[PDB]
């Protein structure tokens, strides 16, 4: 078998990130929110999607016609997105729930967010894929989402989601996110490495 170079790079990077010792700030992203709660998170998030580019123009031209003939509204409620915008919201202590993508490509973009969210007192969760967050906000990718205000109808729903994240993500893991990650080896890998280690330690010290 002869894999292409880019396919070989992909799979080696997968194994390499496992064998190495991942620091606690980077290993906490290996432990994401469970599948049930993530579904409930995105149910609430999909009631606050920002309006589409067509739907916004549809609304604006509707109001433009009214003034063109002859002529006050409510504050829009939606989900907050954008790394700089969300980080500014967390430092402002305005965010109620921060949802960090688990595979942001340069990981240091989000590596401080769990600590910043815990410093400011914001309930946060790490959810799977940057594309699920992107889907909510009509983008291809969202490194992080945040909820600051919801309608009075969904105040009780958000209070249930926040408790579930607290019970299933923060109360859980917790100590597991303070431990260096990695070093995971296959079923037969330690035995092979033990033979290699004892052979090397015998006389192969140069």
């Amino acid at each position: 078998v002869k894999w292409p170079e880019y396919i070989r790079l992909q799979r080696r990077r997968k194994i390499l990130n496992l064998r190495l010792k991942v620091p606690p700030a980077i290993a906490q992203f290996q432990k994401t929110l469970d599948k049930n709660t993530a579904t409930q998170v995105f149910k609430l998030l999909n009631k606050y999607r920002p309006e589409t580019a067509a739907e916004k123009k549809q609304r604006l031209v509707a109001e433009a016609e009214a003034v063109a003939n002859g002529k006050v509204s409510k504050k829009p409620y939606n989900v907050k997105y954008g790394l700089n915008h969300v980080v500014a919201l967390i430092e402002a202590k305005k965010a109620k729930l921060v949802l960090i993508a688990s595979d942001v490509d340069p990981i240091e973009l989000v590596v401080f967010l769990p600590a910043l969210c815990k410093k400011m007192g914001v309930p946060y969760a790490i959810v799977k894929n940057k594309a699920r967050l992107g889907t909510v906000i009509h983008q291809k990718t969202a490194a992080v989402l945040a909820v600051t205000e919801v309608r009075e109808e969904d105040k009780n729903e958000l209070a249930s989601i926040v408790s579930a994240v607290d019970a299933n993500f923060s109360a859980k893991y917790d100590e597991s996110r303070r431990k260096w990650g990695g070093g995971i080896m296959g079923g037969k890998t330690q035995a092979l490495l033990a033979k290699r280690a004892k052979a090397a330690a015998a006389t192969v010290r140069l």
């Binding site: 078998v1 799979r11 080696r12 194994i15 190495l20 010792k21 490495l193």
Partner: protein, 179 residues
């Protein structure tokens, strides 16, 4: 299974690399012939410069230990796969300074007992000497007159080192003698 799919990926990565290193070595004629047929051994000059410093007390042992906490010591190699380590040593290897004294000491260690015996010091010296011996055994005045007047290069019927005279340089010759 997440674990089982992980385990077979490591096996495939390991096995394909071993195939690559095998067929890469097969290009060597000597390697093919070779296949057809706790301690430590200081053999690297880098280690010898270090070993000399510890023994000679020039560099304090406590300072050496502190100098060992650097960017490279914290890049641990415990358990990494061969396809990763092999390139890491080839590329990510810190190049420590090298002293001539360790170079001499390594040459002394590498000096075998029969490296320079009586024959290899006498006939080997003899063959070079006799070779050099076989290697070792292995102006005309022209007057610028007649057809030789106004020449620019080697004239007709003149070979080897030669000198040209025109009877006008006689005046300069006498003046030079008087000088």
């Amino acid at each position: 299974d997440s674990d089982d799919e992980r385990d077979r990926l490591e096996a495939d990565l390991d096995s394909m690399y071993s195939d690559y290193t095998k067929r890469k070595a097969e290009s060597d004629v000597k390697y093919r012939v070779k296949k057809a047929r706790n301690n430590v051994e200081i053999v690297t000059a880098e280690a010898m410069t270090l070993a000399q410093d510890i023994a000679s007390r020039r560099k304090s042992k406590a300072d050496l230990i502190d100098e060992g906490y650097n960017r490279w010591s914290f890049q641990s190699k415990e358990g990494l796969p061969d396809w990763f380590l092999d390139e890491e040593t080839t590329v990510n290897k810190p190049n420590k300074p090298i002293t001539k004294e360790a170079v001499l000491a390594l040459r002394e260690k590498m000096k075998a007992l029969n490296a320079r015996p009586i024959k290899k010091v006498l006939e080997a010296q003899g063959r070079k000497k006799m070779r050099t011996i076989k290697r070792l055994q292995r102006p005309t005045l022209v007057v610028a007159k007649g057809p030789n007047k106004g020449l620019k290069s080697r004239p007709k019927g003149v070979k080897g080192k030669y000198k040209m005279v025109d009877s006008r340089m006689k005046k300069d010759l006498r003046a030079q003698k008087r000088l």
